[PDB]
């Protein structure tokens, strides 16, 4: 019976629109606070969702932690610009503690980071994070942006994830990307959808560190204007079907 | 206790935010979890009855009749059907009639009832003349045969007029309802058109206030809750002739419903660039 309480908590999270998810969980623990069996079930479920979806967790003023597979370290999460691993609570979405590998990779990682921030800063400027992660050996660039119409009403989530792995170390590179976008209508929060665009582009670079970053950042800017074009024709298409189905509601014969 | 109030806050929040088409499923899941608790069974019943009243829900009555649930029909804990002269006891979770208490009929109706009867007849005629019938919900230029079981619409329509008397001032509430179903039981839309006039017999001018609510609730196989509303407030010239009074009110309703048709037929999709961030993806010209 206590087992049946678990399956429906999942269903509660399944279809709910994104802007509303935070609220419900907050109360779900308070609802089931004495049941440690479903409390551990909840801690498990939220960490996955939060990791699956690149949740932004704010730290101090003007920083963000990105919760995902790629930043996970043990059960903590890496912020590469600072040299810090963070312990977080997934339910509340806040940081609760902080405790701080080729030498050359780091400065390729950095240069991508700095031109990444410059790009987001001019054109994205609402929650907006950008970070570059480095790891048989590739670099990961990431822009996250959550827009709200007002207060807590979700307008969009933009997740743009880019990985490049090097055999040809200095002359030609492979850059793969995924842009995941979630949008909810202000007119109706039950009208919402997710779309995903994949890219696999080859880029020319030199032994120059920053041209390596600038060339990659030139590709992202263009791939992102591309997805955007697709999206604005998907919105208008949907909006237009909404109008068409709404006019079918009029019960009068149509003159 | 503290939890009882937090369980309520949660039940309220989920039923508040749920689109109409998920409410029933949502309630059922709430009962399995909290079903032994008669306080929250009753809390849920209260919340749903008010919800039902807020949405001019239709409950089928006998063959081909409907009770309409809303403030204006409320009588005690019952609901009036003004033409049959029946108070209906309803189950709000089940959306069914569970008892009826007939009113004693009057050999002679007083004058208010004569206004109500006249407004009732013109309201029904109006729907008859101007609302789509079966061949008009057809997806064709012309009325043809509907092909296959699944293909087609089920449409449920109801209208009613209610009368009350507040300190010798009269009041009439006129109401039209249509609900469209895809397949047979997927609720697609509601149309709710509601009209009040508060007036004296001697008045030659009345104020007719109205509200027209259009809600799309099925869209690309999802339950949604896309609402459009237009409110109206019209001065109408009338006389002591009761039937002409009904015709004048009905002429304004005819025009206001035409005005919404025009509005809906001139909505377009916004093609601004900031669409993702744009509060208005649907706009008029
Ligand atoms: Br939202
Ligand atoms: Br950042
Ligand atoms: Br954006
Ligand atoms: Br909404
Ligand atoms: Br209709
Ligand atoms: Br409450
Ligand atoms: Br309970
Ligand atoms: Br019955
Ligand atoms: Br009556
Ligand atoms: Br009636
Ligand atoms: Br029941
Ligand atoms: Br009866
Ligand atoms: Br009577
Ligand atoms: Br008449
Ligand atoms: Br009826
Ligand atoms: Br009718
Ligand atoms: Br549809
Ligand atoms: Br759905
Ligand atoms: Br309004
Ligand atoms: Br008006
Ligand atoms: Br108007
Ligand atoms: Br007169
Ligand atoms: Br008369
Ligand atoms: Br008019
Ligand atoms: Br028109």
Numbering used by the authors:
A (entry chain B): 4 to 103, 109 to 133, 156 to 165, 170 to 289
B (entry chain A): 2 to 286
From the primary publication:
Apicomplexan parasites, such as Plasmodium spp., rely on an unusual actomyosin motor, termed glideosome, for motility and host cell invasion. Actin filament capping proteins (CPs) are indispensable heterodimeric regulators of actin dynamics. CPs play a crucial role in actin dynamics by binding to the fast-growing barbed end of filamentous actin (F-actin) with high affinity in a Ca2+-independent manner, limiting protomer exchange to the pointed end. Despite retaining several characteristics of a canonical CP, the homodimeric Plasmodium berghei (Pb)CP exhibits crucial differences to the canonical heterodimers.
To gain structural insight into the unusual homodimerization of PbCPαα, we determined the structure of a C-terminally truncated PbCPαα homodimer (PbCPααΔC20), which was the only version of the parasite CPs that produced well-diffracting crystals, to 2.2-Å resolution. The two PbCPαΔC20 subunits form a structure that is less compact and intertwined than the canonical heterodimer, verifying earlier small-angle X-ray scattering (SAXS) and thermal stability analyses. Albeit being a homodimer, the structure is not completely symmetric. Thus, we will refer to chain A of the crystal structure as PbCPα1ΔC20 and chain B as PbCPα2ΔC20. Superposition of the two subunits reveals that structural deviations are mainly present at the dimer interface, possibly to accommodate complementary intersubunit interactions. In PbCPαΔC20, the presence of two identical stalk domains disrupts the formation of a compact structure. The 23-residue Plasmodium CPα-specific insert is located between the globule and cap β-sheets (Ser136–Ala159). The base of the insert is stabilized by a partial disulfide bond between Cys158 and Cys179 in the PbCPα1ΔC20 subunit but not in PbCPα2ΔC20. The H5 helix of PbCPα1ΔC20 is broken at His267 and turns back towards the same subunit in a β-hairpin-like structure (Leu268-Leu286), instead of extending into PbCPα2ΔC20, resulting in very different C termini in the subunits. Residues of the basic patch in PbCPααΔC20 are more buried in the structure, not in close proximity to each other, and the slight asymmetry of the homodimer does not compensate significantly for the loss of contributing residues of PbCPβ.
